[PDB]
Design a protein around this nucleic acid. Structure first.
Length: 84
RNA sequence: CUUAAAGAGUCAACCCUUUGCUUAUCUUCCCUAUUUAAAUGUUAGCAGCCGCAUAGGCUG
């Protein structure tokens, strides 16, 4: 079941240095991080955070986690302090 | 060589109705203000006639 698939379409593509050259790099999301972050920051009540529902109004499209956890995946609120 | 690359959130709203804050009272008792000197810079730069002069002189 666990194999590979490659579609850089719609996928951010950034350069990152290899030390003496560059390496064009595609950042994709982590599945363990998303579901584990939702469960843990809900069960230890972390509230300086966001909520994002992946898929839109039909969350059966993206993944199976999307389809089940339709309440919304939780993202960290990475807002810095503001002066004055 | 930036999760780079890119995108209209628009829309509408009756908050509102009523009310008892009341009552009460010892601020009082005492006090060393004190002492001492130059109005000076000279002081007031004035009162009038001699003249066209608000130019220049005289008079005390």
């Amino acid at each position: 079941c666990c194999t590979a698939k490659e579609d850089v379409t719609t996928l951010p593509q950034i350069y990152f240095k290899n030390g003496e050259g560059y390496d064009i790099l595609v950042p994709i999301g982590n599945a363990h991080n998303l579901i584990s972050g939702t469960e843990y920051l809900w069960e230890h009540k972390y509230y300086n955070t966001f909520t994002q529902k992946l898929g839109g109004s039909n969350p059966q499209n993206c993944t199976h986690a999307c389809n089940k956890m339709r309440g919304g995946f939780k993202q960290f609120n990475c807002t810095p302090p503001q002066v004055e």
